[PDB]
Amino acid sequence: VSKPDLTAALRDVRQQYESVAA
Amino acid sequence: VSKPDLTAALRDVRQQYES
Amino acid sequence: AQIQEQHVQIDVDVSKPDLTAALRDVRQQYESVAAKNLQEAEEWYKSKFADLSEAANRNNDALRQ
Amino acid sequence: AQIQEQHVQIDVD
Amino acid sequence: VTTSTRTYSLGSALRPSTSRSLYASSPGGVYATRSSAVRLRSSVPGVRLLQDSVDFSLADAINTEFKNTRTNEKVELQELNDRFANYIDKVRFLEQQNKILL
Amino acid sequence: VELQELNDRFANYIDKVRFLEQQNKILLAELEQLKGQGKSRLGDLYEEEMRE
Amino acid sequence: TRTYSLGSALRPSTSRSLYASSPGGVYATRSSAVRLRSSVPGVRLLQDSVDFSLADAINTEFKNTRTNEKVELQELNDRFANYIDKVRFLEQQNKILLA
Amino acid sequence: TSRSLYASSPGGVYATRSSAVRLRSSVPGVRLLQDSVDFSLADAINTEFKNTRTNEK
Amino acid sequence: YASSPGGVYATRSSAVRLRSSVPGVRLLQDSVDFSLADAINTEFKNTRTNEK
Amino acid sequence: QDLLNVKMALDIEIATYRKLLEGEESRISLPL
Amino acid sequence: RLQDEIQNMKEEMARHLREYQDLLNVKMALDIEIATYRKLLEGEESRISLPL
Secondary structure, three states, rough: OOOOOOOOOHHHHHHHHHHHOO | OOOHHHHHHHHHHHHHHHO | OOOOOOOOOOEEEOOOOOOHHHHHHHHHHHHHHHHHHHHHHHHHHHHHHHHHHHHHHHHHHHHOO | OHHHOOOEEEEOO | OOOEOOOOOOOOOOOOOOOOOOOOOOOHHOOOOOOOOOOOOOOOOOOOOOOOOOOOOOOHHHHHHOOOOHHHHHHHHHHHHHHHHHHHHHEEEEEHHHHHOO | OHHHHHHEEEEEEEHHHHHHHHHHHHHHHHHOOOOHHHHHHHHHHHHHHOOO | HHHHHOOOOOOOOOOOOOOOOOOOOOOOOOOOOOOOOOOOOOEEEOOOOOOOOOHHHHHHHHHHHHHHHHHHHHHHHHHHHHHHHHHHHHHHHHHHHOO | OOOOOOOOHHHHHHOOOOOOOOOOOOOOOOOOOOOHHHHHHHHHHHHHHOOHHHOOO | OOOOOOOOOOOOOOOOOOOOOOOOOOOOOOOOOHHHHHHHHHHHHHHHHHHO | OOHHHHHHHHHHHHHHHHHHHHHHHHHOOOOO | HHHHHHHHEEEHHHHHHHHHHHHHHHHHHHHHHHHHOOOOOOOOOHOOOOOO
Protein backbone atom coordinates (compact mmCIF):
# COMPACT_ATOMS: atom_id res chain seq x y z
CA VAL A 1 0.00 0.00 0.00
CA SER A 2 2.97 2.47 0.03
CA LYS A 3 2.68 4.71 -1.61
CA PRO A 4 0.65 6.29 -4.37
CA ASP A 5 0.22 8.69 -6.86
CA LEU A 6 3.36 10.92 -6.90
CA THR A 7 6.93 10.98 -5.64
CA ALA A 8 8.75 11.63 -8.98
CA ALA A 9 8.43 15.40 -9.65
CA LEU A 10 9.64 16.37 -6.09
CA ARG A 11 12.59 13.87 -6.33
CA ASP A 12 13.26 14.71 -10.01
CA VAL A 13 13.21 18.54 -9.71
CA ARG A 14 15.73 18.12 -6.80
CA GLN A 15 18.12 15.62 -8.54
CA GLN A 16 17.79 17.75 -11.69
CA TYR A 17 18.74 20.88 -9.60
CA GLU A 18 21.80 18.97 -8.18
CA SER A 19 22.82 17.81 -11.72
CA VAL A 20 22.06 21.41 -12.94
CA ALA A 21 24.43 22.96 -10.33
CA ALA A 22 27.26 21.08 -12.14
CA VAL B 1 8.35 1.62 -5.73
CA SER B 2 7.98 2.88 -2.08
CA LYS B 3 11.78 3.49 -2.38
CA PRO B 4 11.75 7.01 -4.04
CA ASP B 5 15.36 6.57 -4.17
CA LEU B 6 17.65 7.85 -1.38
CA THR B 7 20.64 6.09 -3.05
CA ALA B 8 19.88 8.13 -6.22
CA ALA B 9 19.91 11.33 -4.06
CA LEU B 10 23.30 10.23 -2.54
CA ARG B 11 24.53 9.25 -6.11
CA ASP B 12 23.57 12.71 -7.48
CA VAL B 13 25.47 14.57 -4.69
CA ARG B 14 28.63 12.44 -5.38
CA GLN B 15 28.55 12.68 -9.22
CA GLN B 16 27.71 16.42 -8.84
CA TYR B 17 30.77 16.95 -6.51
CA GLU B 18 32.97 14.89 -8.94
CA SER B 19 31.72 17.11 -11.84
CA ALA C 1 25.96 13.57 -21.01
CA GLN C 2 25.34 15.52 -17.74
CA ILE C 3 21.86 16.58 -19.16
CA GLN C 4 21.28 12.96 -20.32
CA GLU C 5 22.58 11.19 -17.08
CA GLN C 6 20.19 12.50 -14.49
CA HIS C 7 17.69 11.00 -17.20
CA VAL C 8 19.56 8.11 -17.15
CA GLN C 9 20.69 7.19 -14.65
CA ILE C 10 20.76 9.08 -11.84
CA ASP C 11 23.74 7.86 -10.63
CA VAL C 12 22.78 4.31 -12.02
CA ASP C 13 19.92 2.66 -9.91
CA VAL C 14 19.03 -0.95 -8.89
CA SER C 15 15.26 0.18 -9.11
CA LYS C 16 14.42 -2.82 -6.92
CA PRO C 17 15.53 -2.03 -3.30
CA ASP C 18 16.83 -5.43 -2.02
CA LEU C 19 16.21 -7.89 0.77
CA THR C 20 12.82 -6.05 1.10
CA ALA C 21 11.46 -8.86 -1.16
CA ALA C 22 12.99 -11.68 0.94
CA LEU C 23 11.68 -9.98 4.18
CA ARG C 24 8.04 -10.00 2.82
CA ASP C 25 8.60 -13.54 1.50
CA VAL C 26 9.99 -14.58 4.96
CA ARG C 27 6.86 -12.83 6.41
CA GLN C 28 4.42 -14.81 4.19
CA GLN C 29 6.55 -17.99 4.75
CA TYR C 30 6.25 -17.48 8.59
CA GLU C 31 2.45 -17.04 8.06
CA SER C 32 2.62 -20.29 5.95
CA VAL C 33 4.75 -22.02 8.69
CA ALA C 34 2.06 -21.00 11.23
CA ALA C 35 -0.43 -22.72 8.83
CA LYS C 36 1.89 -25.83 8.66
CA ASN C 37 2.14 -25.88 12.50
CA LEU C 38 -1.72 -25.69 12.57
CA GLN C 39 -1.92 -28.58 10.00
CA GLU C 40 0.44 -30.71 12.19
CA ALA C 41 -1.63 -29.62 15.24
CA GLU C 42 -4.65 -31.26 13.49
CA GLU C 43 -2.51 -34.48 13.41
CA TRP C 44 -1.95 -33.84 17.19
CA TYR C 45 -5.75 -33.27 17.54
CA LYS C 46 -6.45 -36.60 15.70
CA SER C 47 -3.88 -38.30 18.01
CA LYS C 48 -5.78 -37.11 21.16
CA PHE C 49 -9.13 -37.91 19.49
CA ALA C 50 -7.66 -41.45 18.96
CA ASP C 51 -6.65 -41.59 22.71
CA LEU C 52 -10.35 -40.72 23.40
CA SER C 53 -11.75 -43.15 20.78
CA GLU C 54 -9.63 -46.08 22.07
CA ALA C 55 -10.43 -45.28 25.75
CA ALA C 56 -14.14 -45.22 24.75
CA ASN C 57 -13.72 -48.60 22.91
CA ARG C 58 -11.74 -50.32 25.76
CA ASN C 59 -14.19 -49.24 28.51
CA ASN C 60 -17.08 -50.29 26.20
CA ASP C 61 -15.51 -53.76 25.71
CA ALA C 62 -14.92 -53.98 29.51
CA LEU C 63 -18.70 -53.30 30.12
CA ARG C 64 -19.69 -55.62 27.19
CA GLN C 65 -17.48 -58.27 28.90
CA ALA D 1 31.22 14.35 -13.99
CA GLN D 2 29.86 11.68 -16.47
CA ILE D 3 32.25 9.10 -14.91
CA GLN D 4 30.63 9.88 -11.48
CA GLU D 5 26.99 9.78 -12.83
CA GLN D 6 27.93 6.29 -14.23
CA HIS D 7 27.26 4.65 -10.85
CA VAL D 8 24.47 3.75 -8.15
CA GLN D 9 21.15 4.12 -6.30
CA ILE D 10 19.35 1.35 -4.26
CA ASP D 11 16.64 2.41 -1.66
CA VAL D 12 16.19 0.29 1.54
CA ASP D 13 13.83 -2.07 3.42
CA VAL E 1 -0.21 24.33 -39.53
CA THR E 2 0.69 20.72 -40.40
CA THR E 3 -0.44 18.06 -37.87
CA SER E 4 -0.55 14.25 -37.87
CA THR E 5 -4.30 13.44 -37.45
CA ARG E 6 -4.95 11.72 -34.08
CA THR E 7 -5.90 8.05 -34.19
CA TYR E 8 -6.59 6.18 -30.88
CA SER E 9 -6.33 2.80 -29.00
CA LEU E 10 -10.04 1.91 -29.73
CA GLY E 11 -9.15 -1.85 -29.69
CA SER E 12 -9.55 -1.48 -25.86
CA ALA E 13 -13.13 -0.12 -26.31
CA LEU E 14 -13.86 -3.23 -28.44
CA ARG E 15 -13.84 -5.57 -25.34
CA PRO E 16 -16.37 -8.37 -26.29
CA SER E 17 -16.10 -11.38 -23.97
CA THR E 18 -19.55 -12.89 -24.60
CA SER E 19 -19.05 -15.79 -22.13
CA ARG E 20 -21.99 -17.28 -20.20
CA SER E 21 -22.02 -20.98 -19.17
CA LEU E 22 -24.05 -23.50 -17.06
CA TYR E 23 -24.81 -21.52 -13.84
CA ALA E 24 -27.55 -24.10 -12.91
CA SER E 25 -27.31 -26.19 -9.68
CA SER E 26 -28.39 -29.91 -9.54
CA PRO E 27 -27.89 -31.12 -13.19
CA GLY E 28 -31.02 -33.08 -14.29
CA GLY E 29 -32.95 -31.70 -11.22
CA VAL E 30 -31.06 -34.15 -8.95
CA TYR E 31 -31.26 -34.50 -5.18
CA ALA E 32 -31.33 -37.54 -2.80
CA THR E 33 -35.11 -38.32 -3.01
CA ARG E 34 -36.44 -40.72 -0.30
CA SER E 35 -36.31 -44.38 -1.22
CA SER E 36 -38.14 -46.67 1.26
CA ALA E 37 -38.87 -50.29 0.29
CA VAL E 38 -40.54 -53.47 1.61
CA ARG E 39 -39.59 -53.94 5.34
CA LEU E 40 -36.98 -56.73 4.82
CA ARG E 41 -35.80 -57.97 8.28
CA SER E 42 -32.40 -59.35 7.25
CA SER E 43 -29.83 -59.61 10.00
CA VAL E 44 -26.52 -58.20 8.65
CA PRO E 45 -23.40 -59.03 10.79
CA GLY E 46 -21.92 -55.69 9.65
CA VAL E 47 -18.29 -56.46 8.63
CA ARG E 48 -17.19 -52.80 8.44
CA LEU E 49 -15.15 -51.16 5.87
CA LEU E 50 -13.77 -48.53 8.25
CA GLN E 51 -13.30 -45.21 6.43
CA ASP E 52 -10.05 -43.44 7.41
CA SER E 53 -11.19 -40.98 4.69
CA VAL E 54 -14.16 -39.73 6.82
CA ASP E 55 -13.12 -36.44 5.29
CA PHE E 56 -9.38 -37.11 4.94
CA SER E 57 -9.95 -33.34 4.22
CA LEU E 58 -6.73 -32.33 5.99
CA ALA E 59 -5.36 -33.93 2.75
CA ASP E 60 -7.69 -31.68 0.55
CA ALA E 61 -6.90 -28.49 2.42
CA ILE E 62 -3.38 -29.96 1.81
CA ASN E 63 -4.34 -30.38 -1.94
CA THR E 64 -4.98 -26.60 -1.75
CA GLU E 65 -1.56 -26.23 0.06
CA PHE E 66 0.23 -28.51 -2.53
CA LYS E 67 -0.85 -25.51 -4.69
CA ASN E 68 -0.37 -22.62 -2.20
CA THR E 69 3.22 -23.97 -2.11
CA ARG E 70 3.03 -23.57 -5.95
CA THR E 71 1.51 -20.06 -5.56
CA ASN E 72 4.33 -18.79 -3.26
CA GLU E 73 7.10 -20.31 -5.48
CA LYS E 74 5.34 -18.68 -8.50
CA VAL E 75 4.96 -15.29 -6.70
CA GLU E 76 8.75 -15.54 -6.17
CA LEU E 77 9.02 -16.52 -9.93
CA GLN E 78 7.16 -13.28 -10.88
CA GLU E 79 9.12 -11.14 -8.32
CA LEU E 80 12.44 -12.57 -9.69
CA ASN E 81 11.14 -12.15 -13.30
CA ASP E 82 10.43 -8.48 -12.52
CA ARG E 83 13.83 -8.31 -10.67
CA PHE E 84 15.57 -9.43 -13.94
CA ALA E 85 13.43 -6.80 -15.76
CA ASN E 86 14.74 -4.13 -13.29
CA TYR E 87 18.35 -5.29 -14.01
CA ILE E 88 17.57 -5.07 -17.82
CA ASP E 89 16.59 -1.41 -17.20
CA LYS E 90 19.98 -1.13 -15.40
CA VAL E 91 21.52 -2.61 -18.64
CA ARG E 92 19.68 0.07 -20.76
CA PHE E 93 21.09 2.79 -18.47
CA LEU E 94 24.70 1.51 -18.84
CA GLU E 95 24.13 0.98 -22.62
CA GLN E 96 23.28 4.74 -22.68
CA GLN E 97 26.54 5.54 -20.78
CA ASN E 98 28.34 3.27 -23.32
CA LYS E 99 26.96 5.55 -26.16
CA ILE E 100 28.25 8.74 -24.41
CA LEU E 101 31.83 7.40 -24.01
CA LEU E 102 31.62 6.11 -27.66
CA VAL F 1 12.35 10.00 -13.96
CA GLU F 2 13.36 7.21 -16.41
CA LEU F 3 15.39 6.00 -13.36
CA GLN F 4 12.16 6.22 -11.24
CA GLU F 5 9.92 4.71 -14.03
CA LEU F 6 12.50 1.88 -14.06
CA ASN F 7 11.66 1.14 -10.35
CA ASP F 8 7.94 1.47 -11.25
CA ARG F 9 8.50 -0.96 -14.13
CA PHE F 10 10.32 -3.14 -11.57
CA ALA F 11 7.03 -3.05 -9.53
CA ASN F 12 4.86 -3.72 -12.66
CA TYR F 13 7.30 -6.55 -13.68
CA ILE F 14 7.24 -7.87 -10.06
CA ASP F 15 3.34 -7.83 -10.40
CA LYS F 16 3.88 -9.90 -13.56
CA VAL F 17 6.17 -12.32 -11.57
CA ARG F 18 3.77 -12.35 -8.53
CA PHE F 19 0.96 -13.32 -10.98
CA LEU F 20 3.23 -15.86 -12.76
CA GLU F 21 3.93 -17.62 -9.44
CA GLN F 22 0.43 -17.05 -7.91
CA GLN F 23 -1.50 -18.34 -11.00
CA ASN F 24 0.74 -21.42 -10.63
CA LYS F 25 0.13 -21.37 -6.78
CA ILE F 26 -3.71 -21.17 -7.13
CA LEU F 27 -3.41 -24.03 -9.69
CA LEU F 28 -1.16 -26.11 -7.33
CA ALA F 29 -3.52 -25.49 -4.35
CA GLU F 30 -6.66 -26.22 -6.54
CA LEU F 31 -4.82 -29.54 -7.55
CA GLU F 32 -2.63 -30.96 -4.68
CA GLN F 33 -5.61 -32.34 -2.72
CA LEU F 34 -6.54 -33.98 -6.12
CA LYS F 35 -3.01 -35.58 -6.45
CA GLY F 36 -1.36 -36.74 -3.18
CA GLN F 37 -4.44 -36.96 -1.01
CA GLY F 38 -5.90 -37.82 -4.50
CA LYS F 39 -4.41 -41.35 -4.05
CA SER F 40 -4.46 -41.75 -0.24
CA ARG F 41 -8.23 -40.79 -0.03
CA LEU F 42 -8.86 -43.29 -2.89
CA GLY F 43 -7.40 -46.19 -0.83
CA ASP F 44 -9.30 -44.73 2.20
CA LEU F 45 -12.53 -45.09 0.09
CA TYR F 46 -11.68 -48.51 -1.47
CA GLU F 47 -11.33 -49.98 2.07
CA GLU F 48 -14.90 -48.65 2.89
CA GLU F 49 -16.12 -50.29 -0.39
CA MET F 50 -14.13 -53.40 0.74
CA ARG F 51 -15.81 -53.23 4.23
CA GLU F 52 -19.41 -53.66 2.97
CA THR G 1 7.13 13.92 -45.24
CA ARG G 2 6.67 10.94 -42.85
CA THR G 3 4.27 8.00 -43.50
CA TYR G 4 2.70 8.33 -39.99
CA SER G 5 -0.74 9.23 -38.56
CA LEU G 6 -0.40 9.76 -34.78
CA GLY G 7 -1.08 6.55 -32.76
CA SER G 8 -1.44 4.33 -35.91
CA ALA G 9 1.51 2.04 -34.88
CA LEU G 10 -0.46 0.41 -31.99
CA ARG G 11 -4.17 -0.18 -31.43
CA PRO G 12 -4.12 -2.98 -28.76
CA SER G 13 -6.90 -5.20 -30.16
CA THR G 14 -8.90 -6.71 -27.23
CA SER G 15 -11.28 -7.97 -29.97
CA ARG G 16 -11.20 -11.72 -29.07
CA SER G 17 -15.00 -12.22 -29.33
CA LEU G 18 -15.17 -15.88 -28.17
CA TYR G 19 -18.40 -17.59 -26.99
CA ALA G 20 -18.02 -20.97 -25.24
CA SER G 21 -21.66 -21.86 -24.29
CA SER G 22 -20.52 -25.53 -24.03
CA PRO G 23 -22.27 -27.66 -21.32
CA GLY G 24 -19.33 -29.07 -19.27
CA GLY G 25 -21.89 -30.69 -16.88
CA VAL G 26 -22.93 -34.24 -17.97
CA TYR G 27 -25.71 -36.08 -16.04
CA ALA G 28 -23.94 -38.87 -14.06
CA THR G 29 -27.02 -41.09 -14.47
CA ARG G 30 -28.28 -42.70 -11.22
CA SER G 31 -30.86 -45.52 -11.15
CA SER G 32 -32.66 -47.10 -8.17
CA ALA G 33 -35.66 -49.19 -9.23
CA VAL G 34 -37.51 -50.60 -6.15
CA ARG G 35 -35.08 -52.99 -4.49
CA LEU G 36 -37.25 -56.08 -3.83
CA ARG G 37 -36.99 -58.70 -1.00
CA SER G 38 -33.23 -59.46 -1.17
CA SER G 39 -33.76 -62.47 1.16
CA VAL G 40 -31.52 -64.35 -1.33
CA PRO G 41 -28.31 -64.55 0.83
CA GLY G 42 -25.86 -65.19 -2.11
CA VAL G 43 -24.25 -61.68 -2.02
CA ARG G 44 -20.53 -62.50 -1.53
CA LEU G 45 -18.35 -59.78 0.01
CA LEU G 46 -15.54 -58.15 -2.03
CA GLN G 47 -13.88 -54.85 -0.89
CA ASP G 48 -11.48 -54.13 -3.75
CA SER G 49 -9.94 -50.57 -3.73
CA VAL G 50 -8.48 -48.02 -4.67
CA ASP G 51 -5.48 -47.47 -7.12
CA PHE G 52 -5.74 -44.47 -8.07
CA SER G 53 -1.93 -44.55 -8.77
CA LEU G 54 -2.90 -41.77 -11.25
CA ALA G 55 -3.66 -39.59 -8.15
CA ASP G 56 -0.07 -40.26 -6.88
CA ALA G 57 1.18 -39.51 -10.41
CA ILE G 58 -0.85 -36.21 -10.14
CA ASN G 59 0.70 -35.59 -6.64
CA THR G 60 4.10 -36.17 -8.35
CA GLU G 61 3.05 -33.79 -11.20
CA PHE G 62 2.18 -31.19 -8.47
CA LYS G 63 5.72 -31.71 -7.01
CA ASN G 64 7.14 -31.46 -10.58
CA THR G 65 5.01 -28.36 -11.41
CA ARG G 66 6.23 -26.72 -8.15
CA THR G 67 9.80 -27.81 -9.02
CA ASN G 68 9.34 -26.13 -12.44
CA GLU G 69 7.83 -23.05 -10.65
CA LYS G 70 11.09 -23.15 -8.48
CA VAL G 71 13.52 -23.93 -11.40
CA GLU G 72 11.88 -21.00 -13.26
CA LEU G 73 12.45 -18.68 -10.20
CA GLN G 74 16.09 -20.02 -10.08
CA GLU G 75 16.67 -19.61 -13.88
CA LEU G 76 15.23 -16.05 -13.46
CA ASN G 77 17.58 -15.45 -10.46
CA ASP G 78 20.52 -16.64 -12.64
CA ARG G 79 19.03 -14.54 -15.51
CA PHE G 80 19.12 -11.48 -13.21
CA ALA G 81 22.77 -12.49 -12.46
CA ASN G 82 23.34 -12.64 -16.28
CA TYR G 83 21.82 -9.10 -16.55
CA ILE G 84 24.00 -7.92 -13.58
CA ASP G 85 26.92 -9.29 -15.68
CA LYS G 86 25.46 -7.29 -18.65
CA VAL G 87 25.37 -4.25 -16.27
CA ARG G 88 29.07 -5.02 -15.55
CA PHE G 89 29.62 -5.63 -19.32
CA LEU G 90 28.22 -2.19 -20.41
CA GLU G 91 30.13 -0.67 -17.43
CA GLN G 92 33.27 -2.51 -18.70
CA GLN G 93 32.60 -1.45 -22.34
CA ASN G 94 32.16 2.22 -21.26
CA LYS G 95 35.43 1.90 -19.21
CA ILE G 96 37.23 0.46 -22.32
CA LEU G 97 35.90 3.40 -24.40
CA LEU G 98 37.17 5.70 -21.56
CA ALA G 99 40.68 4.10 -21.68
CA THR H 1 5.20 12.88 -49.46
CA SER H 2 4.83 9.06 -49.76
CA ARG H 3 3.44 6.97 -46.89
CA SER H 4 1.47 3.73 -47.55
CA LEU H 5 -0.08 0.73 -45.70
CA TYR H 6 2.66 -0.23 -43.15
CA ALA H 7 0.07 -2.34 -41.18
CA SER H 8 0.53 -6.13 -40.72
CA SER H 9 -2.44 -8.61 -40.83
CA PRO H 10 -5.02 -6.79 -43.09
CA GLY H 11 -8.48 -6.96 -41.42
CA GLY H 12 -6.81 -8.07 -38.10
CA VAL H 13 -6.32 -11.60 -39.55
CA TYR H 14 -4.58 -14.58 -37.97
CA ALA H 15 -5.39 -18.35 -37.85
CA THR H 16 -7.88 -18.30 -34.90
CA ARG H 17 -8.67 -21.75 -33.38
CA SER H 18 -11.60 -23.54 -34.96
CA SER H 19 -12.70 -26.69 -33.06
CA ALA H 20 -16.04 -28.33 -33.90
CA VAL H 21 -18.30 -31.24 -32.87
CA ARG H 22 -16.11 -34.40 -32.34
CA LEU H 23 -17.02 -36.18 -35.63
CA ARG H 24 -15.39 -39.68 -35.63
CA SER H 25 -15.23 -40.22 -39.40
CA SER H 26 -12.65 -42.70 -40.59
CA VAL H 27 -10.81 -41.13 -43.58
CA PRO H 28 -8.68 -43.60 -45.67
CA GLY H 29 -6.31 -40.69 -46.42
CA VAL H 30 -5.61 -40.85 -50.20
CA ARG H 31 -2.69 -38.38 -50.13
CA LEU H 32 -1.98 -35.62 -52.44
CA LEU H 33 1.77 -35.75 -51.89
CA GLN H 34 3.27 -32.25 -52.03
CA ASP H 35 6.60 -32.14 -53.92
CA SER H 36 6.22 -28.37 -53.30
CA VAL H 37 6.79 -28.77 -49.50
CA ASP H 38 8.69 -25.55 -50.03
CA PHE H 39 9.87 -26.16 -53.61
CA SER H 40 11.77 -23.04 -52.28
CA LEU H 41 14.99 -24.01 -54.05
CA ALA H 42 12.80 -22.86 -57.02
CA ASP H 43 11.99 -19.48 -55.21
CA ALA H 44 15.57 -18.80 -54.19
CA ILE H 45 15.96 -19.74 -57.92
CA ASN H 46 13.15 -17.16 -58.73
CA THR H 47 15.51 -14.69 -56.97
CA GLU H 48 18.42 -16.15 -59.08
CA PHE H 49 16.33 -15.97 -62.36
CA LYS H 50 16.66 -12.26 -61.40
CA ASN H 51 20.22 -12.20 -59.94
CA THR H 52 21.11 -13.57 -63.43
CA ARG H 53 19.18 -10.46 -64.68
CA THR H 54 21.04 -8.23 -62.16
CA ASN H 55 24.54 -9.38 -63.29
CA GLU H 56 23.66 -9.07 -67.04
CA LYS H 57 22.24 -5.56 -66.24
CA TYR I 1 1.27 11.36 -52.82
CA ALA I 2 0.11 7.76 -53.45
CA SER I 3 -1.75 6.87 -50.19
CA SER I 4 -3.55 4.09 -52.17
CA PRO I 5 -4.37 0.86 -50.19
CA GLY I 6 -2.77 -1.90 -52.34
CA GLY I 7 -3.82 -4.47 -49.64
CA VAL I 8 -7.33 -5.93 -50.24
CA TYR I 9 -8.88 -8.28 -47.61
CA ALA I 10 -8.84 -11.79 -49.18
CA THR I 11 -12.07 -12.64 -47.35
CA ARG I 12 -12.01 -15.96 -45.43
CA SER I 13 -15.15 -17.62 -44.00
CA SER I 14 -15.47 -20.67 -41.72
CA ALA I 15 -18.94 -20.96 -40.18
CA VAL I 16 -19.12 -23.96 -37.76
CA ARG I 17 -18.64 -27.05 -39.91
CA LEU I 18 -21.44 -29.36 -38.69
CA ARG I 19 -21.54 -33.23 -38.56
CA SER I 20 -20.32 -34.02 -42.10
CA SER I 21 -21.35 -37.70 -41.61
CA VAL I 22 -22.89 -37.37 -45.11
CA PRO I 23 -20.28 -39.45 -47.08
CA GLY I 24 -21.12 -37.99 -50.57
CA VAL I 25 -17.90 -35.87 -50.88
CA ARG I 26 -16.38 -37.19 -54.15
CA LEU I 27 -12.61 -36.75 -54.60
CA LEU I 28 -11.25 -34.46 -57.37
CA GLN I 29 -7.57 -33.26 -57.36
CA ASP I 30 -7.48 -30.95 -60.37
CA SER I 31 -4.29 -28.75 -60.63
CA VAL I 32 -2.36 -26.51 -61.52
CA ASP I 33 -1.86 -24.68 -64.93
CA PHE I 34 -0.46 -21.94 -64.19
CA SER I 35 0.96 -21.90 -67.80
CA LEU I 36 1.02 -18.11 -67.12
CA ALA I 37 3.83 -18.84 -64.56
CA ASP I 38 5.82 -20.61 -67.36
CA ALA I 39 5.02 -17.66 -69.64
CA ILE I 40 6.41 -15.42 -66.78
CA ASN I 41 9.50 -17.74 -66.54
CA THR I 42 9.84 -17.26 -70.34
CA GLU I 43 9.38 -13.45 -69.86
CA PHE I 44 12.22 -13.62 -67.24
CA LYS I 45 14.40 -15.43 -69.87
CA ASN I 46 13.30 -12.80 -72.46
CA THR I 47 13.91 -9.88 -70.02
CA ARG I 48 17.41 -11.31 -69.27
CA THR I 49 17.94 -11.79 -73.04
CA ASN I 50 16.99 -8.10 -73.52
CA GLU I 51 19.32 -7.18 -70.57
CA LYS I 52 22.03 -9.21 -72.55
CA GLN J 1 39.42 12.01 -5.41
CA ASP J 2 36.30 13.50 -3.70
CA LEU J 3 34.15 12.59 -6.75
CA LEU J 4 35.79 9.10 -6.59
CA ASN J 5 34.54 8.72 -2.96
CA VAL J 6 30.95 9.12 -4.37
CA LYS J 7 31.74 6.85 -7.41
CA MET J 8 33.06 4.10 -5.06
CA ALA J 9 29.80 4.47 -3.04
CA LEU J 10 27.81 3.82 -6.29
CA ASP J 11 30.17 0.85 -7.00
CA ILE J 12 29.35 -0.53 -3.49
CA GLU J 13 25.62 0.07 -4.31
CA ILE J 14 26.18 -1.98 -7.56
CA ALA J 15 27.97 -4.72 -5.51
CA THR J 16 24.88 -4.59 -3.18
CA TYR J 17 22.34 -4.54 -6.10
CA ARG J 18 24.00 -7.82 -7.18
CA LYS J 19 23.16 -9.29 -3.70
CA LEU J 20 19.56 -7.91 -3.91
CA LEU J 21 19.08 -9.50 -7.40
CA GLU J 22 20.70 -12.70 -5.99
CA GLY J 23 18.25 -12.60 -3.02
CA GLU J 24 15.02 -11.77 -4.96
CA GLU J 25 15.35 -14.35 -7.80
CA SER J 26 16.22 -16.87 -5.01
CA ARG J 27 12.79 -16.05 -3.37
CA ILE J 28 11.33 -16.89 -6.84
CA SER J 29 13.35 -20.21 -7.07
CA LEU J 30 11.92 -22.67 -4.81
CA PRO J 31 11.69 -26.02 -2.85
CA LEU J 32 10.17 -29.54 -3.11
CA ARG K 1 -19.26 -42.88 22.37
CA LEU K 2 -21.77 -40.05 21.75
CA GLN K 3 -20.46 -37.82 24.63
CA ASP K 4 -16.69 -38.04 23.95
CA GLU K 5 -17.01 -37.07 20.24
CA ILE K 6 -19.93 -34.55 20.76
CA GLN K 7 -17.69 -32.92 23.44
CA ASN K 8 -14.54 -33.15 21.22
CA MET K 9 -16.79 -31.37 18.67
CA LYS K 10 -18.23 -28.82 21.18
CA GLU K 11 -14.74 -27.95 22.53
CA GLU K 12 -12.89 -28.04 19.13
CA MET K 13 -15.57 -25.94 17.35
CA ALA K 14 -15.64 -23.26 20.09
CA ARG K 15 -11.79 -23.32 19.55
CA HIS K 16 -11.80 -23.32 15.64
CA LEU K 17 -13.94 -20.14 15.49
CA ARG K 18 -11.49 -18.54 17.99
CA GLU K 19 -8.44 -20.03 16.13
CA TYR K 20 -9.62 -18.53 12.81
CA GLN K 21 -10.40 -15.37 14.88
CA ASP K 22 -6.78 -15.42 16.27
CA LEU K 23 -5.15 -15.97 12.82
CA LEU K 24 -7.36 -12.95 11.90
CA ASN K 25 -6.16 -11.20 15.15
CA VAL K 26 -2.52 -11.74 14.00
CA LYS K 27 -3.69 -10.26 10.64
CA MET K 28 -5.33 -7.35 12.57
CA ALA K 29 -2.17 -6.72 14.69
CA LEU K 30 -0.11 -6.79 11.46
CA ASP K 31 -2.61 -4.24 9.97
CA ILE K 32 -1.94 -1.77 12.91
CA GLU K 33 1.88 -2.36 12.86
CA ILE K 34 1.88 -2.02 9.05
CA ALA K 35 -0.01 1.34 9.61
CA THR K 36 2.62 2.61 12.08
CA TYR K 37 5.31 1.63 9.51
CA ARG K 38 3.31 2.86 6.42
CA LYS K 39 2.56 6.37 7.82
CA LEU K 40 6.39 6.83 8.21
CA LEU K 41 8.14 4.93 5.33
CA GLU K 42 5.44 5.07 2.63
CA GLY K 43 4.64 8.30 4.60
CA GLU K 44 8.04 9.79 3.51
CA GLU K 45 7.41 8.27 0.11
CA SER K 46 4.47 10.70 1.00
CA ARG K 47 6.44 13.62 -0.48
CA ILE K 48 6.06 11.42 -3.62
CA SER K 49 3.10 9.22 -2.12
CA LEU K 50 1.16 8.94 1.58
CA PRO K 51 -0.44 6.50 4.52
CA LEU K 52 -3.25 4.32 6.20
